[PDB]
């Protein structure tokens, strides 16, 4: 409750779960919520988001499907130009700077 921002406390818990690459059992649940902070609206959270989801894949890997049903939201709101904004599109670059393959033409 006395947390200025609250934010450190969420980035280092990715960094924990990213560790936690080397446990296959637990990549089911924790791909799934680096993805969600991959995805934050905060812009710092965002790039601590992503920069975890790297070191998690040194020590794992990630695939198609995973990357589809994840992203599946960023998909969505693809549709209309207005909907794409000053993070979003920064969601949309680092998603794919990782894991490129994943989007085509």
């Known amino acids: 409750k006395s947390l200025p921002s609250l934010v450190p406390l969420r980035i280092a818990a990715l960094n924990a779960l990213a560790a936690c690459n080397y446990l296959p059992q637990s990549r089911e649940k924790i791909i799934a919520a680096l993805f969600k902070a991959l995805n934050s609206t905060n812009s710092e959270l965002q ?3 992503e920069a975890c989801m ?3 894949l040194e020590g794992a890997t990630i695939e198609v ?3 589809h049903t994840h992203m599946r939201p960023l998909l969505m709101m693809l549709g209309d130009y ?5 993070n979003v599109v920064n969601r949309l670059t680092s ?3 990782l894991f490129p393959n994943s ?3």
């Open 54 to 56: 790297r070191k998690f």
């Open 103 to 105: 989007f085509n033409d």
């Open 82 to 86: 207005r909907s794409l904004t000053l």
């Open 95 to 97: 998603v794919t700077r």
């Open 65 to 67: 499907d995973q990357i």
């Open 47 to 49: 790039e601590a988001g």
